[PDB]
Amino acid sequence: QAGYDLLGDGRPETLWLGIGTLLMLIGTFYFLVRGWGVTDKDAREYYAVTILVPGIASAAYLSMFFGIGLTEVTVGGEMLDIYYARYADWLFTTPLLLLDLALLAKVDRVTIGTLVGVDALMIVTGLIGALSHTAIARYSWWLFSTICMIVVLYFLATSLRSAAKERGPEVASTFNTLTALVLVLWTAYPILWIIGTEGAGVVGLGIETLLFMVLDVTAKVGFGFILLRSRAILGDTEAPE
Ligand SMILES: *C\C=C(C)/C=C/C=C(C)/C=C/C1=C(C)CCCC1(C)C
Numbered sequence: 001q002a003g004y005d006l007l008g009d010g011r012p013e014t015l016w017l018g019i020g021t022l023l024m025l026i027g028t029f030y031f032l033v034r035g036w037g038v039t040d041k042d043a044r045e046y047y048a049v050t051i052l053v054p055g056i057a058s059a060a061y062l063s064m065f066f067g068i069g070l071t072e073v074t075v076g077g078e079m080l081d082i083y084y085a086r087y088a089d090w091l092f093t094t095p096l097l098l099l100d101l102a103l104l105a106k107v108d109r110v111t112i113g114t115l116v117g118v119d120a121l122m123i124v125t126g127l128i129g130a131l132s133h134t135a136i137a138r139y140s141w142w143l144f145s146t147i148c149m150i151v152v153l154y155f156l157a158t159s160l161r162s163a164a165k166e167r168g169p170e171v172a173s174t175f176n177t178l179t180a181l182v183l184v185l186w187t188a189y190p191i192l193w194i195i196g197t198e199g200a201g202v203v204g205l206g207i208e209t210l211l212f213m214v215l216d217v218t219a220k221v222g223f224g225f226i227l228l229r230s231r232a233i234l235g236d237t238e239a240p241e
């Protein structure tokens with residue numbers, strides 16, 4: 001794999017995992033310190049949700065860097081590396097990012113349940129695909145997971161967008177800018193997976209780990225930076241509970 005075997009354990013992708021860990025930690029601490037000076041009850045909710053996004057990713061990246069949760073999946077003559085913490089991270093952080101968007105939109109708890117349930121199914125079926133032992137199974141689960149992603153993104157772009165519009169320009173503009181980021185960046189994930197080690201195998205583990213690290217940092221720290229600097233986070237919220 002393209003990279004550098006930092007820990008001397010035969011894993012050049014640790015260069016990227018290590019850089020990812022550092023960036024996630026810096027982002028977590030930045031949001032934490034910025035949050036300490038926030039008093040508005042709504043803004044504090046966005047900070048709490050958002051700090052946890054690079055925070056949990058920090059833990060996952062540190063895990064992966066040290067090789068905790070790494071195994072091999074047999075696919076014919078090949079043995080493909082799977083990091084469980086990648087999927088566990090996404091399982092927690094994608095619902096948190098969706099909750100940020102749902103708070104902005106001020107949508108009801110059944111809408112939120114639908115959005116996060118389909119998102120959880122997306123991640124679970126991606127994991128099943130990653131653990132599957134035939135190409136046909138891996139591609140099939142990938143397709144199912146991708147359909148789930150399209151459903152999530154469609155809900156964001158329609159139902160939540162229309163709800164956010166009613167909340168006036170500040171909220172609408174922030175919702176729209178973050179949704180623009182999400183529709184593009186999230187779609188990059190299935191593309192990378194299917195061209196990479198889990199799918200067609202064009203892109204190797206090194207380049208793939210690098211690019212997932214860039215996507216992760218952008219979709220977590222980048223997203224959070226954009227959200228938390230906005231006046232929209234001062235607007236009234238209604239948590240699902
Ligand atoms: C770290 C934060 C984010 C935004 C992660 C997003 C992850 C996905 C959108 C993953 C999607 C997948 C699909 C649609 C198909 C199977 C392969 C994936 C699990 C990578």
Ligand SMILES: CCCCCCCCCCCCCCCC
Pocket residue numbers: 023024026027030217218221222
């Ligand atoms: C104004 C001070 C900024 C401090 C932010 C620290 C976070 C560093 C992590 C890098 C995140 C890059 C996101 C990419 C955006 C497209």
Ligand SMILES: CCCCCCCCCCCCCCCC
Pocket residue numbers: 108110111114118147148151
């Ligand atoms: C209170 C109004 C919101 C109603 C939302 C529920 C709609 C049902 C959609 C179910 C989506 C599951 C599809 C699974 C992914 C292929």
Ligand SMILES: CCCCCCCCCCCCCCCC
Pocket residue numbers: 136140141143144147
């Ligand atoms: C010789 C291979 C054995 C038979 C396997 C065929 C499975 C094909 C199913 C494809 C599932 C697509 C998921 C998308 C949701 C409709």
Ligand SMILES: CCCCCCCCCCCCCCCC
Pocket residue numbers: 150153154157183184187188
């Ligand atoms: C209103 C449309 C909602 C559904 C959109 C789902 C797919 C998003 C399309 C964006 C494609 C980005 C490609 C980037 C290639 C690097």
Ligand SMILES: CCCCCCCCCCCCCCCC
Pocket residue numbers: 004015019023213214217
């Ligand atoms: C001998 C070891 C060579 C190390 C070369 C590292 C290349 C540059 C590191 C930056 C990686 C991209 C960061 C993306 C930020 C989100």
Ligand SMILES: CCCCCCCCC
Pocket residue numbers: 004019
């Ligand atoms: C032999 C040690 C290589 C360290 C790579 C660091 C690259 C800068 C981010």
Ligand SMILES: CCCCCCCCC
Pocket residue numbers: 028032051052055056059
């Ligand atoms: C309050 C800082 C972020 C906490 C992240 C939780 C996961 C770490 C194990």
Ligand SMILES: CCCCCCCCC
Pocket residue numbers: 059060062063066
């Ligand atoms: C919750 C953080 C996971 C990383 C553990 C580090 C163990 C080093 C051997």
Ligand SMILES: [Ca+2]
Pocket residue numbers: 040041042043233234235236
């Ligand atoms: Ca307020």
Ligand SMILES: [Cl-]
Pocket residue numbers: 037038039040043
């Ligand atoms: Cl405040």
Ligand SMILES: [Cl-]
Pocket residue numbers: 039040041042
């Ligand atoms: Cl207040």
Ligand SMILES: [Cl-]
Pocket residue numbers: 001002203204205206207208
């Ligand atoms: Cl590679």
Ligand code: NA
Pocket residue numbers: 004005006007008009010011012014015
């Ligand atoms: Na290493």
